[PDB]
């Protein structure tokens, strides 16, 4: 299709590519848009498989809730929230970490990496914990990112992910979608780093956007859908294992995301 | 009638003459804040409705930075008037000048200017009123002390004091400073005079605060030899009561040495005397905001601490 082409900046995601190249090919129209929506949508998730782009692409859809000039306005406004989504979260999450604090990281996530350089902005001194991710190669990536901001940083193996548990202060990763229970959905190395921490009793802290909102409610590992496993490369963690999630409407706790996953609409 | 007191800001010793020939010892840095400031706070939380600033040397410096500090504000319940003279040269002149002005009424506070105090008196004042109502203006003195054992690193040789008081009613009869003595001595008159308790304490950190009283100048004005307060009481009891008071749980001491200033120093950090403390910034002060950390670590704005840096204990 046309997301591929917009995949030159690294620094936004795919979900956000979808959200925008939706946008774009909005105005090329020539009631019946909401099929056509919808097998646009369809057809930008058969490239890429991610509960976060479906989420999104639903999300975008429902403002609908000639006469189109007020349907375009809304994109590019979306956009713009989403984009200051990012910022918001950062300086939301930037304030629980203290000076000497150990951070683990399971994989690369650009809104962990932009909350730490939010905290290392506010004059923070702390060493960052990094899984290697032998899936695919991020966590190193990760490191290299981070390598830059004179922030001390090491990457361990996925397999040593329970024995620097205990040099831990608190663990902070990304979600690909939020389940209505509380639960997150991430990759696959999350479900059993989250049992270390809670066996540790370490705080367990996650940051997402509002636009990752996805309406499912799994019970245990195979209750995901099949069609966003893909060696899975995602998996699911139980809301109980969580202590506070960071978002764009606010610090959430797992068992108050359902009231605004309920008054999202989606 | 409401409440006043004397604040001598100039000190007559030379103690601390390596420095001073650029700064007075009340402007003295202790914890970023001064030792008059100090002083001022303790005697606004005391109770004190007006004080008495007594200026000698370098009365300059003292005034105007003064004016600068929260206590001259309109907005205050303690007011502060400064006095200039210098021809000042003791205590005894001073005393002296406010007996001459008629500038005290009743009962006041004298106090020096490198004080550090969280003391509320509303106890020691109450009974030592009561007890000059009882007996018609016999005690003029009602001095305080504070219990602590000889060996604190905050009692030094050169302001370690024996004196020897009545269990039953508190009122000193001995005065005298151990500055290089070994085996000291006690004159048979109480022994022989009085009974019921002639104990002897040598348990009490010198505050240097006492309540006086309105006759306490006239009687310093009477006889022209008198220079600081330890000859006076020293003199009185030698024919007028002095009394005393002991302290707990609270703290109070006098800058003098430079041992005594290190010693006052570490307690302040410590929070030895709260709520006077560095993070609680009483001197209402934009450029003195700190935050308190774990350890008793100190922080202020912009503090840009480096990578690698240990702060192993209480550092402001």
Known sequence: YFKSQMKEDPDMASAVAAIRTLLEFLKRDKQGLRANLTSAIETLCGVDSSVAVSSGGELFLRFISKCKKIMIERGELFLRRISLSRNKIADLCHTFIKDGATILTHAYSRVVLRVLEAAVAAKKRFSVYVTESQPDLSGKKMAKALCHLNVPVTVVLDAAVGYIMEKADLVIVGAEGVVENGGIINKIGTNQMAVCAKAQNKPFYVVAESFKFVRLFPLNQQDVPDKFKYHPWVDYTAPSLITLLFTDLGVLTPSAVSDELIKLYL | ?316
């Open chain 2, 1 to 316: 009638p409401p409440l006043q007191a004397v604040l001598v800001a100039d000190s007559f010793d030379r103690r601390f003459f390596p420095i001073s020939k650029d700064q007075p010892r009340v402007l003295l840095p202790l914890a970023n804040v001064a030792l008059i400031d100090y002083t001022l706070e303790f005697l606004t939380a005391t109770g004190v409705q007006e004080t008495f600033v007594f200026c000698c040397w370098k009365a300059a410096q003292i005034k105007e930075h003064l004016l600068k500090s929260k206590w001259c504000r309109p907005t205050s319940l303690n007011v502060v008037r400064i006095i200039t003279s210098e021809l000042y040269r003791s205590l005894g002149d001073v005393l002296r000048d406010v007996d001459a002005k008629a500038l005290v009424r009743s009962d006041f506070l004298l106090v020096y200017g490198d004080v550090i105090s969280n003391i509320n008196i509303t106890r020691a004042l109450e009974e030592h009123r009561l007890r000059r109502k009882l007996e018609k203006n016999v005690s003029v003195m009602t001095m305080i002390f504070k219990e602590s054992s000889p060996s604190h690193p905050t009692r030094c040789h050169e302001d370690n004091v024996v004196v020897a008081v009545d269990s039953t009613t508190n009122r000193v009869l001995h005065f005298q400073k151990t500055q290089g003595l070994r085996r000291f001595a006690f004159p048979l008159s109480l022994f022989q005079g009085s009974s019921d308790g002639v104990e002897v304490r040598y348990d009490l950190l010198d505050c240097h605060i006492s309540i006086c009283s309105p006759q306490v100048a006239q009687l310093f004005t009477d006889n022209f030899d008198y220079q600081t307060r330890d000859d006076f009481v020293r003199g009185l009891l030698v024919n007028n009561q002095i009394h005393m008071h002991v302290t707990a749980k609270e703290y109070g001491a006098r800058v003098s040495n430079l041992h005594m200033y290190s010693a006052v120093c570490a307690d302040v950090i410590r929070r030895w005397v709260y709520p006077l403390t560095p993070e609680a910034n009483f001197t209402d002060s934009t450029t003195q905001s700190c935050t308190h950390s774990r350890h008793n670590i100190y922080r202020g704005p912009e503090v840009s601490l480096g990578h690698g840096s240990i702060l192993e204990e209480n550092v402001l």
